[PDB]
Design an enzyme around this catalytic site. Structure first.
Site, short mmCIF file in Angstrom:
data_model
loop_
_atom_site.label_atom_id
_atom_site.label_comp_id
_atom_site.label_asym_id
_atom_site.label_seq_id
_atom_site.Cartn_x
_atom_site.Cartn_y
_atom_site.Cartn_z
N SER B 140 -8.49 -43.13 -6.86
CA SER B 140 -7.78 -42.51 -5.74
C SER B 140 -7.94 -43.37 -4.49
O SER B 140 -7.51 -44.53 -4.50
CB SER B 140 -8.25 -41.07 -5.60
OG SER B 140 -7.54 -40.49 -4.53
N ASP B 231 0.26 -34.88 -10.53
CA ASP B 231 -0.39 -35.48 -9.37
C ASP B 231 0.75 -35.95 -8.48
O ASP B 231 1.62 -36.69 -8.96
CB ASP B 231 -1.24 -36.66 -9.81
CG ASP B 231 -1.99 -37.33 -8.66
OD1 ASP B 231 -1.78 -36.98 -7.47
OD2 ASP B 231 -2.84 -38.18 -8.96
N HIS B 261 -4.87 -34.82 -10.80
CA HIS B 261 -5.70 -35.72 -10.02
C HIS B 261 -7.16 -35.34 -10.20
O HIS B 261 -7.50 -34.16 -10.34
CB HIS B 261 -5.28 -35.63 -8.54
CG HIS B 261 -5.81 -36.74 -7.68
ND1 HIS B 261 -5.14 -37.93 -7.52
CD2 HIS B 261 -6.92 -36.82 -6.92
CE1 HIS B 261 -5.82 -38.71 -6.69
NE2 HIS B 261 -6.91 -38.06 -6.32
C1 LIG Z 1 -11.48 -34.38 -1.90
C2 LIG Z 1 -10.92 -35.09 -3.13
O1 LIG Z 1 -10.21 -36.22 -2.70
C3 LIG Z 1 -8.90 -35.95 -2.54
O2 LIG Z 1 -8.47 -34.88 -2.92
C4 LIG Z 1 -8.04 -36.84 -1.97
C5 LIG Z 1 -7.13 -36.39 -1.01
C6 LIG Z 1 -6.22 -37.27 -0.41
C7 LIG Z 1 -6.21 -38.62 -0.76
C8 LIG Z 1 -7.11 -39.08 -1.72
C9 LIG Z 1 -8.01 -38.20 -2.33
C10 LIG Z 1 -8.88 -38.73 -3.21
O3 LIG Z 1 -9.52 -39.85 -2.85
O4 LIG Z 1 -9.06 -38.27 -4.31
#
Ligand SMILES: CCOC(=O)c1ccccc1C(=O)O
Lengths: 291, 291
Positions: B140, B231, B261
């Site tokens: 991510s 996702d 995700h």
């Molecule tokens: C708190 C978990 O992270 C996220 O949901 C998240 C939200 C937005 C962008 C990236 C991520 C990520 O890096 O996964």
């Protein structure tokens, strides 16, 4: 003794699915009981994976995944009496999906109907017909077939590597694991007879050396040899890796604490078993990618 | 919607520990809920694996496994706001155990207290100080940081490969996944916005924070890009692989049906997620075998 509650749970579920009375039951009955066990633990096929059966050098085989520059030949276990294409189907399918390499599983002839050397002749026949770069891998008796194939196909046709999964490689029984693990969980004992007797060279007398007794291991494929710690065959893996290095062959021994023989079937409920299969997949990929 | 019962159970367990309204809480409370959710799913460390904390390039890191000719730099996700060395500890340890490669996890500075480009400067600091052949991998926001590192280090210099796991890569939000998965489990398109303000405030956005908008991608390391199908960020993976091949870079896109995700945390309870991580490990091993 094992204390990991996940693998004690796996052991309990294997014993419940596999009542320990199969022996002089019948080779027919043991094959039935072994498939019923395998079905308890069997995982789903990866959707999208193409899978088909095909005769290769006269031996029935199952082919997983699209043609690839490097393949994996998988030889199933079962003490040369049980097993087949369906007993190890999800393992081969997951090797194909994870690595992107095509997998060829070999439905070699089983004893008591076909005694040794039918099994290794069938593996050699598939190997020679495939005539392609490939990693060879196998569990238990199928690991011994994998090791024997490498020893008999040295030179240009050598596999790129051998991945041996709790193999029995012909140790004479004097190593400590035979003592320490004589009553190991998931050991059937009444299978050792069906597997030594008739089945093997202890059937009509014949030398045809097993891997741990061959003396010129020089030049065979690099080895990744993984053992279950709680298994009488553990030190066969130790011994073969030690002999392989003395011959100048690259080889690694990974021993798995807290796991019994057959633990690939536990990979969906045991962190230890799942990590082991992750390491087995990475070793396959390591050998396949040429360098 | 998802219908795999294994995945639905994983989502139910995630939502109980990390309620979707945590994405909008203060950074300190968000961090506490994220850490709590991580604890629900954390697997055990491999018992024989050496693990130690070390500052590298000034940045605190965690080093898994013995020194190896090739390493793996793992950049954790968490929207640049949550996560750390402990949040992804079991994934890193499993990479090291399976591949035999040393893994370095990076505790980069977090938003909203530390705005971009703190995160990429911290990753560059570690990378430069390591001075080591290595594969780079991340999930991510950590996948964006790995992609941003490759784009900023295309000389001596470069990662041997980039493994990007459900990354967000600066898609503008018009690809189909942003509508079809706008209400997806565990990550909605609206949660995307909250975190974006948290990374840049409201100033101008550095082009390197948006790999999908970078005009020239020519010489970055080859890529394995795996997306979750359910996702909103899915089509960032599809888009980047497309743009990379148009720039002469080798790139494989794997998309994961029925997975949301954050599915790395489901690998202990979901066949789909377990196989995906098996493929991720293999991709790392594929890239690593060089120098
Ligand atoms: C708190 C978990 O992270 C996220 O949901 C998240 C939200 C937005 C962008 C990236 C991520 C990520 O890096 O996964």
């Amino acid at each position: 003794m094992i204390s990991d509650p996940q693998v004690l749970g796996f052991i309990a579920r294997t014993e419940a699915a596999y009542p320990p009375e199969a022996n002089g039951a019948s080779a027919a009955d043991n094959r039935r009981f072994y498939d019923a066990m395998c079905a308890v633990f069997r995982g789903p096929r990866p959707p999208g994976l193409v899978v088909g059966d095909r005769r290769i050098g006269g031996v029935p085989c199952r082919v997983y995944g699209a043609d690839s520059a490097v393949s994996v030949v998988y030889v199933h276990g079962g003490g040369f009496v049980v097993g087949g294409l369906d007993s190890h189907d999800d393992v081969c399918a997951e090797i194909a999906d994870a690595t992107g390499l095509q997998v060829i599983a070999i439905d070699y002839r089983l004893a008591p109907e076909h005694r040794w050397p039918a099994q290794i002749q069938d593996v050699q026949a598939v190997w020679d017909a495939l005539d392609r770069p490939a990693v060879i891998a196998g569990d238990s008796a199928g690991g011994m077939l994998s090791a024997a194939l490498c020893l008999s196909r040295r030179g240009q046709r050598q596999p790129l590597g051998q991945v041996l999964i709790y193999p029995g490689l012909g140790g004479d029984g004097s190593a400590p694991s035979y003592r320490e693990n004589a009553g190991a969980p998931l050991l059937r004992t009444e299978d050792l007879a069906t597997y030594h007797a008739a089945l093997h060279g202890d059937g009509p007398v014949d030398p045809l050396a097993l891997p741990l007794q061959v003396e010129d291991l020089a030049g065979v494929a690099p080895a990744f040899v993984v053992s279950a710690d709680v298994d009488p065959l553990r030190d066969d893996a130790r011994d073969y890796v030690q002999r392989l290095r003395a011959a100048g062959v690259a080889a690694e021994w990974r021993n798995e604490p807290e796991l019994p023989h057959g633990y690939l079937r536990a990979r969906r409920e045991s962190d230890r078993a799942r990590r082991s299969f992750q390491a087995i997949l990475s070793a396959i990929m390591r050998f396949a990618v040429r360098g």
